[PDB]
Copies of this chain bind each other. A is one copy, B any other.
């Protein structure tokens, strides 16, 4: 259907996250427990947010690097719907996380932050991974790296390989038309919703512009 809207809670404490969710939880489709929040509070963040918003998809952005079955199980036992595994993880890490996800009727996303290869991407596909997150790194953004046509070419290629593609990384309202034409599964916004003068209006403008374009 239309691309979904995910909010990233990149906060260090639950009470800080709740300053955002109390405004916009009903305005988005997916609530992400950001990596920062996973490190700040641990898996209780996932458990708490799913208890609050059980009708929403909750994503634990754990960026699992290894110990796929152990870490995925902690997240899913805390009631996560989706978990992320980082792109450089050994293929057996992705496979282990996916096996656990199936036990809980969840799913795994590969987080494409940093270095990866097209040969690894075929591997994830062969392993049964259906979701990837195309991510312009925060630190790369801060060093002046922009979105460009090489990103759009890569998103299209991933989509043609059969992945559902999430797009993220300092996304602004004005960036949405760059992706016009592509069956994007999810757009993530963290800062552009959380730090907006009006987070509710920020979220609604995202949803309005997605409905315009798709």
Contact = CB atoms under 8 A, between A and B. Distances in A.
Interface residues of A, number: 45
A159 interface: no
A120 B115 contact: yes
A68 B113 CA distance: 12
A89 to B, nearest CB: 5
Interface string A83-98: 0001111101101100
A65 to B, nearest CB: 4
Contacts of A128: none
A137 B93 contact: yes
A138 B72 CA distance: 14
Interface of A: 10, 12, 35-36, 38-44, 62-63, 65-71, 74-75, 86-90, 92-93, 95-96, 111, 113-117, 120, 135, 137-140, 142-143
